[PDB]
């Protein structure tokens, strides 16, 4: 199909952007802004905790993952309340889960406050992961355009 463009992505993510059905596996403090191994270690800890909680009758919270130029919003499915919100410039890393096509996570937070959010997607995680890649790419693209913009101004 048609290759993506900056303009297509700006239209896709502006305003309310897009959203996906998911469940929150958990949230973990992590030492670094980025890293595959760190992210997977955190995913495995949180999945272990979720399995323990599930053996005691608990359930993962049902959520919407909302992706827009405003960043990521975690929204409670039942109430519609925004539980968590991170702007684009406070999300540092997107992790795939090599054990689970229906899981992914992201590291977010300012310095010294890195946290891994582990998400169990209702469908395949990949489209959501690709949306995050595209979101970051188009914001980066636009900013570098308006930088080359100003180096030519003088």
């Amino acid at each position: 199909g048609p290759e993506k463009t900056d303009e297509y992505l700006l239209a896709r993510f502006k305003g309310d952007g897009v959203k996906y059905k998911a469940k929150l596996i958990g949230i973990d403090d992590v030492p670094d802004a980025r890293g595959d191994k760190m992210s997977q270690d955190s995913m495995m800890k949180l999945k272990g905790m979720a399995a323990a909680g599930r053996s005691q009758g608990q359930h993962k919270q049902r959520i919407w993952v909302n992706i827009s130029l405003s960043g990521i919003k975690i929204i409670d499915e039942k109430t519609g309340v925004i539980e968590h919100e991170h702007p684009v410039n406070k999300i540092s890393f997107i992790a795939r889960d090599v054990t689970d096509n229906r899981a992914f996570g992201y590291v977010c937070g300012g310095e010294g406050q890195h946290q891994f959010f582990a998400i169990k997607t209702g469908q395949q995680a990949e489209p959501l992961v690709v949306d995050l890649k595209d979101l970051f790419q188009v914001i980066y693209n636009v900013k570098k355009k308006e930088e080359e913009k100003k180096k030519i101004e003088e």
Partner: peptide, 11 residues
């Protein structure tokens, strides 16, 4: 298999 956000600002 993950990727960085080039727009990340820690401070």
């Amino acid at each position: 298999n993950g990727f960085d956000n080039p727009n990340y600002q820690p401070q």
